[PDB]
Amino acid sequence: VQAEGEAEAAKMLGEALSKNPGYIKLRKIRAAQNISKTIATSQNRIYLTADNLVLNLQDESFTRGSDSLIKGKK
Amino acid sequence: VQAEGEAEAAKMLGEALSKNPGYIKLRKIRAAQNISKTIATSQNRIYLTADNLVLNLQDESFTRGSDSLIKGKK
Amino acid sequence: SQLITQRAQVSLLIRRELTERAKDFSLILDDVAITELSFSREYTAAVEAKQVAQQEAQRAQFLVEKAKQEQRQKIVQAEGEAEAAKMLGEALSKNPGYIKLRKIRAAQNISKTIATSQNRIYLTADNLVLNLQDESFTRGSDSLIKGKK
Amino acid sequence: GELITQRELVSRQVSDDLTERAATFGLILDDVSLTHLTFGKEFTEAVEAKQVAQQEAERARFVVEKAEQQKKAAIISAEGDSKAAELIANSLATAGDGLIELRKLEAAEDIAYQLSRSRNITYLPAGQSVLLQLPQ
Amino acid sequence: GELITQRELVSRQVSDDLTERAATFGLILDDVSLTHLTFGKEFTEAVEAKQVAQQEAERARFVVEKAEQQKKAAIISAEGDSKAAELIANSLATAGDGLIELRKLEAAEDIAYQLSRSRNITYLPAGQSVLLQLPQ
């Protein structure tokens, strides 16, 4: 009975989301929110990547990774 | 009721912006504004990229990344 | 709670039984009255909190309204950044005259204020001037040659 | 519970038993009853909680109505960030890559006018096989 | 609320009850009433807030009109930066790569005349497989 709980929850997460990464990304990202809200209680030494804090600002990497908005450069 | 709030807001952000990256870039960029306005309260060690602070000034990378204005070099 | 709510019943029953308890040994009790009453809190704590929150609901409903309307504050806030976008937008669709010029008045005022900063800047092919004769220099200069740009 | 949902019986039993008890020792207990009385904690306290939280029920019933009106704020800190999207999306869709572009570099200013308040920003190119090493 | 939207009833009830009460103890309460009176906080204070923020409504109604006229400044710190674009764009489009170019290096001066006030600038080439290492 413990883990029919984690299995029917899996039912209704499972039949639920098979279209496109709307909330799976949103939840990666509410992760980015609450995760590193609690990294406060942490002492994480984080080290990062291409376009996270913002600043490939004009390198073509920036703008091609921005033109996902151009439907075709995504 | 908490997160119908984040869902109908998603409605009216969603049907709203499916043309071209006008404000999505503008908001990347008002990000660049307020984000690093508040990086003041931060102590960020930022490290940067091809054409952010301005100065590929004549390298062909500069001018081809500038001739986006030439309709075809964008 | 039923003690607090019906403390009259409690004190009345106490006196009713105690007068007959005392009268057995020739003791006429004119008065028998409860002087104090206590609990831990929990029953009454939740019982109070229910009406606390019932009207906290009201406390924030009119705030819902206040906010419905403090959002046309923001409506008017950012038509400002949108019509400015109109007249920046229909304005510049030819060639990078001022967009470069403004990259470059950036290079001006940006690093004018990098004074108030402590930037450790690190730089690139032809910024401070000195590929002076390397063919990279001269091909990145012959943009002036109409065709080497 | 039965000790005091029927305490009259308990006290009377102890009292008459003790009276007949003292009688044998030449002692007339003209009256006796239970001075003090208690129990453990949670058979004691949980039938209490039974009606405690039948009212905790109303407490939460009504904290629900508080949250109903709290989360309007989460709606509404973003409502206008979204209408601005309404506007500028169909603006520079038909219009083109004008302020798609140029606010990037009204940014550059407002960006690092403030990055000055930061003190360790850095920079590199691309188009090469650019390859980073960084300081302490 | 009902205690004092109808306090006359509450005080009169307490008063006549206490008068008949003291009568049995040989005491003529010729008058009685509720000296002191209060409640909790927020059933108390939120029906208050109900009309508080019906006026907070006007407060925000009118802070809206303040922002209307604040954000002209955001328009107008950039208005002229833009007309200069109007001008020089069609200037050196027809004209060519003259001051497209030469202000780069009236820059070089005004750039590092001021970079002097900075104290850790550095420099490298390209055209090679240039590869950076930097100091502390």
> How many Cβ atoms are within 10 Å of E96's Cβ, its own excluded?
12
Pick from E42, E56, E90: CB nearest C55: E42
Return the closest-CA partner of residue D106 out of E105, C79, C110, E108.
C110
Neighbours of chain B (3+ CB pairs under 8 A): A, C, D, E
A46-54: Cβ within 8 A, 24+ apart: A53/B35, A53/B44, A53/B46, A54/B28, A54/B31, A54/B32, A54/B35, A54/B36
User: Which amino acid belongs to residue D43?
Assistant: F
Terminal alpha carbon distance of chain E: 71
Q: What share of chain E is helix, strand, coil (3-state, %, to 5)?
A: 70, 0, 30
**Which residues are CB-neighbours of E114 under 8 A, at least 6 positions away?**
C111, C112, C115
Read off the tokens for C93: 């669709």
- Give the gap in angstroms from C-alpha B20 to the nearest C-alpha of chain A: 6
Chain D residues touching residue C13 (CB < 8 angstroms)? none
Please tell me if residue A53 touches chain B, with a CB cutoff of 8 Å: yes
**Which residues are CB-neighbours of E16 under 8 A, at least 6 positions away?**
E32
3-state SS assignment for residue B15: coil
Read off the tokens for A16: 């639920």
Neighbours of chain D (3+ CB pairs under 8 A): A, B, C, E
Choose from D30, D86, D99, D133 for mutation: most chain C CBs within 10 A.
D99
Q: How far apart are CA D72 and CA D56, in angstroms?
A: 25
Query: Angle CA(B58)–CA(B59)–CA(B64) in degrees, nearest 5?
Result: 90
Return the closest-CA partner of residue C122 out of B44, D134, B58, D127.
D134
- Give the gap in angstroms from C-alpha C27 to the nearest C-alpha of chain E: 18
Q: Where are the alpha helices (DSSP H) in A1-74?
A: 5-14, 22-38, 60-64
Total count of residues recorded for chain C: 149
- Give the gap in angstroms from C-alpha E13 to the nearest C-alpha of chain C: 15
Contact C122 D124 (CB under 8 A): yes
**Which residues are CB-neighbours of C93 under 8 A, at least 6 positions away?**
B71, D95, D96, D97, D98
3-state SS assignment for residue D39: coil
Chain D residues touching residue B32 (CB < 8 angstroms)? 104, 107-108, 110-111
Return the closest-CA partner of residue B32 out of E5, E27, C106, C104.
C106
Neighbours of chain E (3+ CB pairs under 8 A): B, C, D
Radius of gyration of chain B (CA): 18
Query: What's CA C93's distance to the chain center, in Å?
Result: 39
Chain C residues touching residue D66 (CB < 8 angstroms)? 53, 56-57, 59-60
**Which residues in chain E (22-51) have CB-CB distances under 8 A to chain B?**
none
Choose from C103, C122, C131, C145 for mutation: most chain B CBs within 10 A.
C103
User: Which amino acid belongs to residue D73?
Assistant: A
**Which residues are CB-neighbours of D133 under 8 A, at least 6 positions away?**
E132, E133, E134
Query: Angle CA(A33)–CA(A39)–CA(A42) in degrees, nearest 5?
Result: 170
Distances (CA, A) of A63 to A58, B51, B67, D100: 6, 11, 13, 11
Using CA of residue B18, residue A60, residue B28, residue C126, what is the dihedral sign? negative
> How many Cβ atoms are within 10 Å of D16's Cβ, its own excluded?
12
User: Which amino acid belongs to residue D125?
Assistant: P
Return the closest-CA partner of residue E79 out of D84, C68, D85, C83.
C83
Query: Angle CA(B2)–CA(B5)–CA(B6) in degrees, nearest 5?
Result: 100
Chain B residues touching residue E126 (CB < 8 angstroms)? 59
In degrees and rounded to multiples of 5, residue A50 shows phi and psi of -55, -55
Q: How far apart are CA D19 and CA E31, in angstroms?
A: 52
Contact C77 E97 (CB under 8 A): no
Contact B32 A53 (CB under 8 A): no
Return the closest-CA partner of residue C123 out of B16, E66, E108, D98.
E108
Distances (CA, A) of D89 to B38, C86, D59, D106: 27, 11, 46, 19
For residue E56, count CB atoms less than 10 angstroms from its CB and return exposed for 0-12, middle for 13-18, buried for 19 or more.
Answer: middle
Query: What's CA B17's distance to the chain center, in Å?
Result: 15
Chain C residues touching residue B61 (CB < 8 angstroms)? 125
Please tell me if residue E133 touches chain C, with a CB cutoff of 8 Å: no
For residue C20, count CB atoms less than 10 angstroms from its CB and return exposed for 0-12, middle for 13-18, buried for 19 or more.
Answer: exposed
Return the closest-CA partner of residue D130 out of B58, B52, A61, C132.
A61
> How many Cβ atoms are within 10 Å of B18's Cβ, its own excluded?
11
Q: How far apart are CA A35 and CA A44, in angstroms?
A: 11
Q: How far apart are CA A25 and CA D78, in angstroms?
A: 19
Q: How far apart are CA C97 and CA E84, in angstroms?
A: 10
* Rounded (10°) angle between helices D72-95 and B22-38: 130
Read off the tokens for A37: 């809200």
Chain A residues touching residue D101 (CB < 8 angstroms)? none
Chain B residues touching residue A53 (CB < 8 angstroms)? 35, 44, 46
- D-E interface: how many C-beta pairs under 8 angstroms? 13
Pick from B54, B63, B70: CB nearest C104: B54
Concatenated DSSP letters of chain C: -HHHHTHHHHHHHHHHHHHHHHHTTS---S----------SHHHHHHHHHHHHHHHHHHHHHHHHHHHHHHHHHHHHHHHHHHHHHHHHTT--S-SHHHHHHHHHHHHHHHHHTTTTT------TTTTS--TTSHHHHHTTGGGSTT--
Q: How far apart are CA B45 and CA A55, in angstroms?
A: 12
Q: How far apart are CA B49 and CA D126, in angstroms?
A: 7
Task: Tell which phi-psi region holds residue C26, choosing left (phi > 0), alpha (psi between -120 and 50) or beta.
Answer: left
Read off the tokens for E104: 């780069």
> How many Cβ atoms are within 10 Å of E86's Cβ, its own excluded?
14
Return the closest-CA partner of residue C131 out of E127, B56, B60.
E127
Q: How far apart are CA E23 and CA E17, in angstroms?
A: 10
**Which residues are CB-neighbours of A15 under 8 A, at least 6 positions away?**
none
For residue C93, count CB atoms less than 10 angstroms from its CB and return exposed for 0-12, middle for 13-18, buried for 19 or more.
Answer: middle
**Which residues in chain D (71-110) have CB-CB distances under 8 A to chain C?**
72-73, 76, 79-81, 83-84, 87-88, 91-92, 95-103, 105-106, 108-109
Resolution value (Å, 1 decimal): 21.0
Q: How far apart are CA A61 and CA A66, in angstroms?
A: 8
Return the closest-CA partner of residue C50 out of D54, E86, A36, B59.
D54
Return the closest-CA partner of residue E34 out of E15, E21, E16.
E15
Q: Are D73 and B50 in contact (CB under 8 A)?
A: no
